[PDB]
Amino acid sequence: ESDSVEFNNAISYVNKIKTRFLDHPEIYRSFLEILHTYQKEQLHTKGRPFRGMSEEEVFTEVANLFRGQEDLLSEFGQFLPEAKR
């Protein structure tokens, strides 16, 4: 049947981000730009995947962009594989 629930959980998040940042159309540039430092790994090597950087940094930047809304970074925590509790 194929698992794409968590895909849609990502969609719903991005769509929420895009819907709340209507006053701020600029965030849609810089948000992903920061995660592009993360995601780079997959295309950077000629072989294995990596971690990118420290998961704390990619967080750190996005927080300054989004600032005021802690509830978004709450959902960001899903996409950070830490402990899972």
Partner: peptide, 24 residues
């Protein structure tokens, strides 16, 4: 279970393309 930050760049490019799909 593939919930990594990779999903955000996936969901973003997906959603960009989705708007353009919708117009027809």
């Amino acid at each position: 279970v593939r919930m990594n930050i990779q999903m955000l760049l996936e969901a973003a490019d997906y959603l960009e393309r989705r708007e353009r799909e919708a117009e027809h």
